[PDB]
Ligand binder design. Sequence first.
Ligand SMILES: NC(=O)c1ccc[n+]([C@@H]2O[C@H](COP(=O)([O-])OP(=O)(O)OC[C@H]3O[C@@H](n4cnc5c(N)ncnc54)[C@H](OP(=O)(O)O)[C@@H]3O)[C@@H](O)[C@H]2O)c1
Ligand SMILES: COc1cc(CN)cc(Cl)c1OCC(=O)NC(C)(C)C
Length: 316
Amino acid sequence: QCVKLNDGHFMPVLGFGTYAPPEVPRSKALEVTKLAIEAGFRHIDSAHLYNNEEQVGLAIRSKIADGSVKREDIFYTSKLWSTFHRPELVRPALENSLKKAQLDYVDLYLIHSPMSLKPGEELSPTDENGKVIFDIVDLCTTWEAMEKCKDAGLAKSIGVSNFNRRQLEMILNKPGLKYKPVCNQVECHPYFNRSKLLDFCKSKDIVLVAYSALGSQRDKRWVDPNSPVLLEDPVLCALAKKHKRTPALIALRYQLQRGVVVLAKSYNEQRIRQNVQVFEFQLTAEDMKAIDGLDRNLHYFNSDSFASHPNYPYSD
Ligand SMILES: NC(=O)c1ccc[n+]([C@@H]2O[C@H](COP(=O)([O-])OP(=O)(O)OC[C@H]3O[C@@H](n4cnc5c(N)ncnc54)[C@H](OP(=O)(O)O)[C@@H]3O)[C@@H](O)[C@H]2O)c1
Ligand SMILES: COc1cc(CN)cc(Cl)c1OCC(=O)NC(C)(C)C
């Protein structure tokens, strides 16, 4: 149930999403990550931004301590936040994430976003109009610093997140490149299926990793509540009835059959256990074509706070 990355490491194809909004106690991330591991999740997706690495790391260490898993069975991801793109900040950021999680290494470290933010101030510096304050950083220098983190053994693999094709090409074409990104973790679901970006990633042996694969958490900070609710989609519902599964399981299975590694966040015990059933059935070619027909260029994250950033990826 893993894919081989372009650096020889292996990534489980179903990952557990650990972000929950501030109104959810930090406490819960511990409980639910333990449940996820218990249910069979072996890929766990976190980030500095999520303010949960202590909890997620403790859950991992607890399941190691009680003999449920070994460290080598777990694939743990963190992400470099955008105020730390300047190359001298990259390794310290990673070391901080490792200290929070109390792990010797991460399996994967990502550049969280191509949108660099002003360093040395707040987590997300914003101007008087609520627009994030940009910084101009050559991301090929950020990437070089990421490569050094791999060479040091702090991260087994390195990749990117929220890059568009041109932004990936900038890294892939860098003189002296040592390591390609193993993946590009992007918003991806039947309303925004990223087929052309997926084709490009496949052509370069870069794994596309889907977030908001179940339609996002529809956070009021970033998501229009008028947007269609993915898990209420009539085609997904019809397919769920056909297969006697659920719309969520259809949406996850869709990604696996296109060669996309898929994340799924749930803080609910029943749904956490349900999501692992993605391995238990399959969709036909006609089912897949029906789901492909849902594409409508819908990125749920759609905010003024990001859309003017000079490296906003959806500009392309
Ligand atoms: N790289 C990035 O910039 C980026 C951006 C966004 C997200 N991510 C990562 O991707 C992960 C997942 O994306 P996401 O947070 O947008 O959420 P998601 O995976 O799209 O899930 C959306 C909602 O689906 C519900 N759900 C889960 N399983 C279900 C089921 N079987 N039936 C019905 N509902 C179900 C969950 O609610 P309950 O909790 O109530 O079950 C969850 O709030 C994040 O946690 C994070 O790790 C990365
Ligand atoms: C959802 O994305 C962001 C969240 C915060 C948190 N305050 C800050 C910034 Cl700069 C964010 O934008 C980064 C980013 O790549 N956003 C995309 C995914 C393009 C919508």
